[PDB]
């Protein structure tokens, strides 16, 4: 003697000031009933949303994540959780006859926000090269894997979480390796290829409202 899609009222979702479009979508939860509140459970989602739809006209392969840490009332504000690239895009990249060069790190920002960053690179094969392979020797390779690491920390260590999310919209870190590896071995398809949050600093409510203002 019941219809289960009456006890569900349509609220709204938001994104921070660093990305372009403000309005993502909507989400539904049950009312204040028995002993559970409609603003207690609605405080830790993950929306694995792209960038193209979040912006005007971008490269779409990057994704993002935006958890709910605060609830306004008919509006769910959001907080940082992760990056990733698209399955398809990354599978395309890996090819036979070329080395691949991964490398990772656990940095911290100045504000609490602790972060694990992955990386990746592929040796390029030039225009007039007859040679089939394009392989790179061990000791060639581990001087890239130390540069990849050196460059990631420098550009996060010294400045806060609000400034290292505006270095991943194109991929700041990405092309800045490409430039500094050339004279060791030339590689092309450089990325951060996953960025993952390991810890958070305690919730202060006014901290989140200069990101929406």
């Amino acid at each position: 003697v019941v219809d289960p899609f009456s006890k569900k009222d349509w609220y709204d979702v938001k994104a921070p000031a660093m990305f372009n479009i403000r309005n993502i979508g909507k989400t539904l939860v049950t009312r204040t009933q028995g002993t559970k509140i409609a603003s207690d459970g609605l405080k830790g989602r993950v929306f694995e949303v792209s960038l193209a739809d979040l912006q005007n006209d971008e490269v779409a392969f990057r994704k993002f994540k935006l958890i709910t840490e605060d609830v306004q009332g008919k509006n769910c504000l959001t907080n940082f959780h992760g990056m990733d690239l698209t399955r398809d895009k990354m599978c395309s990249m890996v090819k036979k006859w070329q080395t691949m060069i991964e490398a990772h790190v656990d940095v911290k920002t100045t504000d609490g926000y602790l972060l694990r960053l992955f990386c990746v690179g592929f040796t390029k094969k030039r225009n007039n090269q007859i040679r089939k392979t394009s392989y790179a020797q061990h000791q060639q390779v581990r001087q890239i894997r130390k540069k990849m690491m050196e460059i990631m920390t420098r550009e996060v260590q010294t400045n806060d979480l609000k400034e290292v999310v505006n270095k991943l919209i194109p991929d700041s870190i990405g092309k800045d390796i490409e430039k500094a590896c050339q004279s060791i071995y030339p590689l092309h398809d450089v990325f951060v290829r996953k960025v993952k949050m390991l810890k958070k600093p305690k919730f202060e409510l006014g901290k989140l409202m200069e990101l929406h203002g």
């Binding site: 698209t86 399955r87 398809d88 895009k89 599978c91 395309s92």
Partner: protein, 101 residues
Amino acid sequence: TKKRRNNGRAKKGRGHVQPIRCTNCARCVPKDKAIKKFVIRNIVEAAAVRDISEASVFDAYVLPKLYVKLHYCVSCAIHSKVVRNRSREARKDRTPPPRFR
């Protein structure tokens, strides 16, 4: 009596190689000996590359390909006719079949 020079497997600097599970059966097969294939494939092949394009959102869009790496044991290969038996000189031709269309 000997029939092949390189005896079913690419290996001349090693002695021992690592095993791989046949993706039709589940048999162990030596990496080198295996028959491998690589598949790249849009999620729309020929029929369904028509219905979605007129009832889709984005102005000028491209759909993703689907990338698999297969691995066959010898009789898994032969049953599913990815490969044939062959005549004695013919055998030799490591020249792969022509992919024009």
